[PDB]
Amino acid sequence: IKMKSSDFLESKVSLAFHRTQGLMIMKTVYKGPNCIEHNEALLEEAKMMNRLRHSRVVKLLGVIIEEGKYSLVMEYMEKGNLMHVLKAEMSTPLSVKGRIILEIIEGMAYLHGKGVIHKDLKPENILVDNDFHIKIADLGLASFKMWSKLNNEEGTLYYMAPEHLNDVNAKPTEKSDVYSFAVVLWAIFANKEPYENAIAEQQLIMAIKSGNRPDVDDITEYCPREIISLMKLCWEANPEARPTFPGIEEKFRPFYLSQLE
């Protein structure tokens, strides 16, 4: 699982070419003074990332732990993130959008089943391959404590549950990821980011905390009536009222097979 920087041809998210295994994605996280006290915990977190093995989760291919330099190596996803694909000038049919929603659900159920709270689910953390299959990613390292710590030693809020806005000590839960899935759902059918009419961040933060949600009327594409009810269910103000991902998969999978696929 551990690699060396010299395992890569010579040229912060970059395309990298490993000398034997080929094209990969490299994110160098820290390039400063030595800090080897963190190293066993960083290595154990990398091993936890590497044990996340599921078709809808980006695989960690390697970790570089060098005396001044820490890097994570991931597999490459050819088509970029969900928002870029939704905005490409070829249209994405309802059947493919339905499949993507189910795969996001499958990936998120798997992560929650492994005791992982994503904490930063958004269209940019949903990557797409050539066949329009998706994998969940963590570009800002929001999910693993020590790597997030190392990233910050010396982000968009459209998808943040309202309980976390203006609250640095609220602990993210499974219901915080369910909130983010709701707005991603809205984005998949609007083909754009929400809240285009916001003027100021404090206006948007306070509006969302008081009950503002993405404009369902701004979906001019056909959006099945059950998916509008799903997003509204998932962005409920009270987290206890939000469903779980296994619960979402149990209602959305038959609906996807009978109507959308």
Place this chain on the structure above:
Amino acid sequence: VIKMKSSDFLESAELVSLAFHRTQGLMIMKTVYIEHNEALLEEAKMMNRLRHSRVVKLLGVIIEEGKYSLVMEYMEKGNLMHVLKAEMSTPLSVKGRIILEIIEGMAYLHGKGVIHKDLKPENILVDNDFHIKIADLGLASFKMWSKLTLYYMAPEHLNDVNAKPTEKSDVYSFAVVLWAIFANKEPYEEQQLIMAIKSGNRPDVDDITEYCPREIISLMKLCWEANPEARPTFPGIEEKFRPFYLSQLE
């Protein structure tokens, strides 16, 4: 649009940077930052069409491969709040002219189908002669370049980010600028205040200790009416305020 190069500038200093152009003088540069380019250039081509004596002009754009910058004309005295708080006094006649120039600038923008949406004293810049220009520091009007305070927000946009701003949203902002011009300070010296504003709270008129003509108090109250329908338009304000300024204030 004029496209410019970073090699066209001698000196830079942060302040958004003040830059010294090789021929055209002092300028303000905001470095903001290939999928983006024809639309990014088209927004700039559109900004450049705002040509008016009371609106800050886009002089050029720098599209370099690690660098995206907007170049604006420089306003020597900074923004309106900085000028109102200086201990050199601003007589009523200069305050009246400033109000009329804000109106001219706002009428011109609306005439071009531009809704400012963020009118406030920080977006009102002042030159050496105390003439003003309307600016958009937060890039609030052009989406993609913005892609790269609530005291002046009309109550219909408070706790409602999906309502579409109108010309009447700028008239509300004008009203609070009026109050600030005569108090020489920001008003309301958030969820509690937001709700009070949504139910009718306004800046305290009794907190204006400077002399303030009766017509400007009534205009202020007219322009900040809860119902957007009751607020005048800027051409409507100009027909009442231009003769009033000439006969009483100038």
